[model samples]
Target chain A: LPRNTNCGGILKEESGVIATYYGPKTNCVWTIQMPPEYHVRVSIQYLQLNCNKESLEIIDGLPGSPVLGKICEGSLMDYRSSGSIMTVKYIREPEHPASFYEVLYFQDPQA
Target chain B: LPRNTNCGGILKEESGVIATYYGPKTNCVWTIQMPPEYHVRVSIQYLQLNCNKESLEIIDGLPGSPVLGKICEGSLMDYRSSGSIMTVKYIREPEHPASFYEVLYFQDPQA
Candidate 1:
């Protein structure tokens, strides 16, 4: 079980969307855990960040798992986990204003 | 647009689930606003609270809108909004442990 923080935390629901504004020097991490036999599908609607000073990483499982992809700015469309858990990390440098991002995630059967 | 507090706030997304814990004397409100022309469909999977001292109210729109239903304990199954917005209020008296609730909501085409 993961704990919730001020910026990010665990999202273990069947389906949900996570959207929020982040300030400078912000580093947020979110873990999505689905039920057994189900995979996670994440759709990055929009992400606005400084490409040189910010990044969004999507991992297939927990931390240190296989890297699905990483985005410095803009949306990467979508990503699906190979297992029941997926991890996302967002980091921004100190020289930045409040940025915003929107992500929609859901559980899907293995296909 | 509603602001997000410690307990609840606005859920303006295509779909999502809201689940959290509430301590004694807890009163929380969540407003769900979907896209235009889309209705809100909420499915209460389970809700555990003292029937005599706690209640969960589902309003069709804002605070004074028509109530879809109220639950003192147990789940009332599901509720759909007449429009694209729905409000949920939960109150628990100061005589209980931390209660819990899970509500899955999504936008649906007008039927």
Candidate 2:
């Protein structure tokens, strides 16, 4: 069976390389906050995983904001939000779901 | 009533300021063909319009690849793509949809 996730996790961007807090082990929901105009930006350095049913979802805004889209085998994805918050929901598989995903994010108010 | 668009319009970008091959007056489908790895990059110079039913749709990739997200009220939007082809679908209101939009796009593969 998959491990218990951290659920309700959040990050404030302290700088370079921020991965799953408390562990994005299983069904983890990681939320990152940002300020107005300054949308949350996420770029995957490397990723190799998938969810049977969008288990790995990346939302552009709040829990129910318009979806920016989903991440996959996950290459160097550069996704910016139209809002101020971003979430990453992970629903891992029971077995070796040892997906080493390195990501970088920040609040970017483009010019 | 809204005007009939150029329909089946395709542009290969011969340089700066390329708006509507023929006419983007109404419900138009604008398709731009970029090259491999060189995805399309669009930044709204200025836009003021609407698509009552999700009208001003700015797709990030080829027809139905995925949603890069949508535009609104319309503001300074900078949207990039993950594919070589990009399309825009405009569904204008059958009235004075006096919405003026100025957008610039380029094919960027990124660093």
Interface RMSD of 1: 20.4
> Which tens-of-lDDT digit does each residue in A1-111 have in candidate 2?
122234546766533454443443557677877755567777665555533332346676667765544434423346776577887766656554435455666667543
List of clashing residue pairs for candidate 1: none
Off by over 4 Å in 2: A1-8, A14-16, A20-25, A50-55, B1-111
Candidate 1: residue A84 Cα off by (Å)? 0.3
Encode model 2's per-residue lDDT on B1-101: one tens digit a residue.
12223444675662223343234355676776776667777665444434343245567666676555444332334566657787776555555443555
Whole-model lDDT per candidate:
0.68, 0.55
Cα error of candidate 1 at position A36, Å? 1.5
* Residue-by-residue lDDT tens digits, candidate 1, A1-111: 122334678888777776654533477888999988899987765555555566677788999986645654332345667789998887777676545667778888633
Task: State the TM-score of candidate 1 restricted to chain B.
Answer: 0.81
Q: What is candidate 2's CA lDDT for residue B3?
A: 24
By TM-score, how accurate is candidate 1?
A: 0.44
TM-score for candidate 2, please give it. Answer: 0.45
**Cα deviation of B33, candidate 1, in Å:** 44
The deviation in Å at residue B51 for candidate 2 is: 36
